Amino acid sequence: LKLPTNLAYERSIDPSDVCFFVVWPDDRKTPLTYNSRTLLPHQVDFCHVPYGASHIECSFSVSFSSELRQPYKCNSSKVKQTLVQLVELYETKIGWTELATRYLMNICNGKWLWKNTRKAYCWNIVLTPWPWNGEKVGFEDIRTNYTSRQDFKNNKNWSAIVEMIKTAFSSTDGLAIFEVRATLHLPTNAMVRPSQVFTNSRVFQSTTIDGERSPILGAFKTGAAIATIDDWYPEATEPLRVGRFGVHREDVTCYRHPSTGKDFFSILQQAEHYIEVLSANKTPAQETINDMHFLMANLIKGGMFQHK
Amino acid sequence: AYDVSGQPIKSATAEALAQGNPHQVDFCHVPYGASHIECSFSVSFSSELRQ
Amino acid sequence: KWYYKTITFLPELCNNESLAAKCLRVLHGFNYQYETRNIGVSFPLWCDATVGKKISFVSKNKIELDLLLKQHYFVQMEQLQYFHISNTVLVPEDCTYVSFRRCQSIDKLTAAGLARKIRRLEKRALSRGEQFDPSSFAQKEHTAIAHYHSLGESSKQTNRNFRLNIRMLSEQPREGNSIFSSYGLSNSENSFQPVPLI
Amino acid sequence: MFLQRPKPYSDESLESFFIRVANKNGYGDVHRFLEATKRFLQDIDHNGYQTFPTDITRINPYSAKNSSSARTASFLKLAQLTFNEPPELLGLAINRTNMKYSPSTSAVVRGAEVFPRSLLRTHSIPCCPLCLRENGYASYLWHFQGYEYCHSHNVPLITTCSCGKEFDYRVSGLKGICCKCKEPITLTGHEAACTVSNWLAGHESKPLPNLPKSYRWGLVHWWMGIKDSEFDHFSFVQFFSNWPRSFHSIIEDEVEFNLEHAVVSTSELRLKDLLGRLFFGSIRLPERNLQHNIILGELLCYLENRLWQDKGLIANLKMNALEATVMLNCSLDQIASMVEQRILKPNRKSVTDYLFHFGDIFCLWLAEFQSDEFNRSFYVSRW
Amino acid sequence: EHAVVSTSELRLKDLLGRLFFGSIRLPERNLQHNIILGELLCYLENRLWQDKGLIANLKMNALEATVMLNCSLDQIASMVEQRILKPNRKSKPNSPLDVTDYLFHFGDIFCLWLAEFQSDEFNRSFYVSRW
């Protein structure tokens, strides 16, 4: 399967910025503020929880959508068919439940709160899905409960949420919006770690709430956190952020390097093979459904699979 | 990482594909407390198609 | 009557702040060994980037200067030729006096210091029966601070890691009062005192 | 957290240890305990934060690639931060090692004993169901493709039951209940292999030598090197039944056949041709410690005695420089420095060309490279 | 006490230099016999993380990793391109291997000896089960 000159996918998981708020024992919310120290112009910033702050809310909104069904561009329809059929046959044979679960787990346990949970007493993820009929779905004390996939499945509203997500991923035009709020508890005067801005010098990426500036975890940082599902790779140890070549950031070197045949554009070169491997009435191997899981997640991330 | 005709690049090592390159994008998003987004414009239909 | 004895750090690879902090540690241990307080310090190369290769000990007393400078740690890093000890010299021509002061107001700017300040304030105000709201004392958004250097330090009686945020401010040799802080710095509450920057 | 360890055994697989520490302190299933320790390594800052394993099949550091360092750090921390008294948790871990076995094959060490990678049971690890029920732990030896009978019960290891069409304690739980049907799992040239398996554990067996339990697996891998596959215990035990006789016959038979069937004449005959497979297939087992590497010992003894028998046909065998760097542990750099210093005799003047004999190199190893254990005196005072 | 450098840059060559690199190969590093390397390694392991990782965060150079655990600096290059090692500083372009600059932490090299390099007798289990 050749790689066309115009191929692009629009992303399905669309998160928003993660805005922080501080809740005082009077139960009113004031946005976080961060010192910006400068020595005499490196301007290192410092965001710590205020003194009397009872706890800290972290709100954001993530939208799952069925933008992965049709490629946003294919200058050659011959490849558009083999990808829309790829998605259809994936969904039919191995349903969306695995990708949906591995996304909603990152949503529902604090994983978008990247480092802000190292020293936290307890954080509760309250979740308000949009096409919803019940109340809010709330997970609490995520290091005491909801520690593994099973504990998630044990919550009474979990199946409905995953069903909504796989619907949004299934329907021709479905979507599913979640407003997530994390009532996080930190020790007195604890460090919050919003996303640094790209430029020692630590300068925070920030927004303005109530006219005054507050620190945020970027929408792209959060999208990176929700997409740490890629545990299917050679000698897989811990999940990666889904990428065309599974990259790591702490230890720079990149797994799924296209030398191995487990990058993206290599297992896309075999999409025709995967079509017939799924089309058989018999179930496919575990490794090949791992390859196709990574392929589907890489479509959900969307992007540009071109060669100009 | 690949050149045309599907051949890996010997210089794109597993440390070269891992280097994070930066981009710059303009980012617009609803403020936090904002209720909703108004969007206003005016469209005028006319008979400039007769002649 | 300013005697001074400088010390220059030899090793071409050395973190001067650490060595200066250890010199001040041992100076402090001295000033608490004998209750003398009349040995001040100076940094004849107080560059922008770092404290320089030198730390000088200045005193009106002559016996205490060389009594200190032959302490155990100094003779030890002398035989290992890390340090270079000079002799007890006077200097009346280097009128280029400065004041190395422990700028304590820098520790009230770190978040864990603002926490201390607010906790103390409310502990006071509630004793005064006043109403204290810790939700108003918001952190300053931009606190640009003057250039300074920091020497980490610890207390033997209670283990903690504070820092002498030492800062050099120019001055004129207004009077020899002959009193320094235990860390050999000039502090405003005690008799402020300049020192000859050799 | 804080845990208590159970009755630590010496020969107990790491996974077995984690099972019997999970089901001892507070956890129902060991998987929960793995997530608990991962949360622990979250709480105290660490590097096993990311790569600490939660599936029990891949706990031993040889499973993680480019994370074995972190996993051993993790085991070190666990061993001195999470128990009432510190356990020997790291010694039970099967981790990689740098040393190889003779033909281009890597090795994995556990405790003080290094096994070849060639026989590791990457999957479908057997068990002694009886020993499971009595002792309550899984011995490590079950992981290797030599241990085919329980050295304590002389029973073949149950790899697949009737209820469970394939079984392993790493999912069972150190108890006799199959995967599908809950019931006792206990079902069932026997002695020709029982002695071998008992000798594989640190023990003695009448025909097999008293080598260190790192060199026993070396013997086994070498035997599979001769017998092109299919390690059978009977031929092994009978081969060590007449030990100095059988191997001497083998090297004679291999050496004589090579000399007739050689296609190029005598003077240019090389030693990878004659004595090609035995010599280099025994030179590095656990290591060339001639006291323990009994095979290389006997081979070198036999070669030394017959060094000059037929025109020194053995002694004047051309070996390339790179084969001298194997014959005696050295660098092509260092043998180059030796020959330009005129230590060796590059028969033709002027680097991977065959320019040196065996005899001049054997005496060279005797003179300038005889190590502490790679030593001549270990084999000369043998049978 | 007399370290002319801070702790975050304190190396192993100076702190504990003569003892370690003076006992690493008395005749050869068999930890059952090389009793002094055995006890030094036991002491260091038992105090790897004592004071916010004092011993653990000790700077080590490639030419010291090659002697703490037998391998050639080219094999170390192969270990650090495979990211089995943790080169705390980034050499962005094309990996120019500098074998002299203090780049690894001792703790993370002690652990790398504990797996990937625990050879036949250069083995941890020889010293831990001692006095």
Ligand SMILES: [Zn+2]
């Ligand atoms: Zn048994």
